Amino acid sequence: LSQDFVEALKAVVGSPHVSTASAVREQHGHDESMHRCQPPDAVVWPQNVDQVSRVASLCYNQGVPIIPFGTGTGVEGGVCAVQGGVCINLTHMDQITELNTEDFSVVVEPGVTRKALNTHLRDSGLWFPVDPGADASLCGMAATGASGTNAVRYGTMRDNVINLEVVLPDGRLLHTAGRGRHYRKSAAGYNLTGLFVGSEGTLGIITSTTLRLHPAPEATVAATCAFPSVQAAVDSTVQILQAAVPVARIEFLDDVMMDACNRHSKLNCPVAPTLFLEFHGSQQTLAEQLQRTEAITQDNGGSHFSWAAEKRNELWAARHNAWYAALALSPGSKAYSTDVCVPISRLPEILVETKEEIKASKLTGAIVGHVGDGNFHCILLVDPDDAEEQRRVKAFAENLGRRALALGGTCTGEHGIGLGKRQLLQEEVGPVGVETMRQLKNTLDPRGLMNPGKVL
Ligand SMILES: Cc1cc2nc3c(=O)[nH]c(=O)nc-3n(C[C@H](O)[C@H](O)[C@H](O)COP(=O)(O)OP(=O)(O)OC[C@H]3O[C@@H](n4cnc5c(N)ncnc54)[C@H](O)[C@@H]3O)c2cc1C
Ligand SMILES: [Mn+2]
């Protein structure tokens, strides 16, 4: 990066908001995954959308890659600057606007986390449900297509993003559904909002997101249920979904993950394949849901429900920290997560096979995830210096991904592709799907400067 170029960047955002210092670039060259740090050539913090547009235009016309950066909690290397360039940290734009309680909508800028939003919403009777474990940027969640434990009932980011404000690679400002618009459904033109959800910073920079809010549940009950085997836990899950019980949360932990979470959060659940459940409704619709759900879990050997404000909060905090609980099994290690999502009737086969495969392998793996969506994570630990173990973990993850594709599923339910799953994506959608995705990338980013090396 030339001195003239750096000075041009400082003219847009101000000298304190541009850094070429090695330590600052290294901090923005990696996310939470094991993907190797690849530092950008500079980090820039735009202070408003006009500055985002002008930074993008400067980079784009000079042939300098752009890497959007939210909270850096991704797990597929999305922020790694594989071709160098300018990392745009968007978190100084942190305002909540256009809170429309009567329409159940709100507009947020990239520095707003879900925690910040739900704090702002206390005493409104509304909440935003999509809950990744990490305290992530909501616009980053829109960029990755995130989901979480609440998605089985309340939907993913794709279900809950109503509109996006996007700075395109050359600096133009796009409101995907129209500036200021919010509504429940539309057939007007092509749905641009869904194209940018899950685009991972390869099609443009999300500078605000319009989110669907939901009413807080009238009443909540959480519980855990221990099972004799993975098969019994996942069969119960499939049967709960087939019985159409509107469970609010249904999270699976294998015995390895349950033990890790016990040690990391000082829970002391029985070490066993376990479901964490939550039910929303009136005092009485809960009783109906509980009866029907306990009946199914009992048929599969589930324990009597161990029931759980503070107790529930510690239960789900432990679940949200499962990633760090797994890492704590081997201090100094990094982690790589699988994220397959299969048709629900095939979930028992692939989960049980994954458990058997982790057992037969020398790898440390913990299993957790959103089995209500037919989705789960195998969290695999890697010694950052053991090159052979890394090759074993990547091979394990790619074999699992190919098994999911063989079952009609997808290689990633929520984390995205980034650097890790590019070959699986090619297999998943085939030559015409890849070419079509690439033609869309090319028309929005002709010079290929919008987060190069990711997704495609
Ligand atoms: C402990 C832990 C638990 C997690 N649990 C979940 C979970 O349950 N569900 C889930 O889906 N994910 C989960 N994640 C992954 C991660 O939190 C999500 O992928 C989240 O959406 C990433 O947001 P971010 O701003 O931190 O992303 P970053 O790492 O900053 O960026 C991720 C990607 O999005 C792009 N990007 C970021 N912000 C923007 C923007 N404003 N405009 C355009 N592109 C942008 C980046 O260029 C990159 O390619 C977890 C992560 C951790 C560490
Ligand atoms: Mn998850």
CATH of the domain at 274: 3.40.462.10
* 156 touches 149 (CB < 8 A): no
d(CA 385, CA 368): 26
Q: Report whether residue 74 contacts ligand 1, using a CB cutoff of 6 Å.
A: yes
Which residues share a beta bridge with 365?
380
Helix locations, 266-374, DSSP H: 283-299, 310-320, 322-327, 347-360
DSSP string, 130-197: ---SS--BHHHHHHHT---TTHHHH--HHHHEEEEEEE-TTS-EEETT-TT---S---SSS-HHHHHT
Domain end point (choices 89, 105, 127): 89
Residue with the nearest Cα to atom 41 of ligand 1? 206
Total structural domains within the chain: 3
* 170 touches 238 (CB < 8 A): no
Domain end point (choices 89, 109, 142): 89
Q: Is 8 helix (H, G, I), strand (E, B) or coil?
A: helix
Quote the tokens at residue 89: 């940290």
Residue from 215, 220, 216 nearest 279 by CA: 220
Quote the tokens at residue 268: 């002391």
d(CA 399, CA 405): 10
Q: Report whether residue 409 contacts ligand 1, using a CB cutoff of 6 Å.
A: no
**424 in a domain, yes or no?**
no
Can you give the residue range of the structural domain that contains 54?
Answer: 3-89
d(CA 298, CA 34): 40
Resolution (A): 1.6
d(CA 109, CA 137): 9
Domain end point (choices 45, 64, 89): 89
Q: Count CA within 13 A, CB hemisphere, residue 67.
A: 29
- Please name which ligand lies nearest the alpha carbon of 340: 2
Which residues share a beta bridge with 275?
225, 252
What's the 295 CA to ligand 1 centre distance in angstroms? 37
Residue with the nearest Cα to atom 52 of ligand 1? 134
Which residues share a beta bridge with 250?
277
Top mutation candidate among 49, 75, 417 for ligand 1, by most atoms within 8 Å of CB: 75
**CATH number of the CATH domain containing 144:** 3.30.465.10
β-pair type (219-226, 86-89):
unpaired
d(CA 375, CA 377): 7
Elucidation technique: X-ray
DSSP string, 411-440: SBSSS--TTTSHHHHHHHHHHHHHHHHHHH
Quote the tokens at residue 370: 């959103």
Question: Which residues touch 422 (CB under 8 Å, ≥6 apart)?
Answer: 454, 455, 456
For residues 319 and 249, state if they share a domain: yes
For residues 50 and 195, state if they share a domain: no
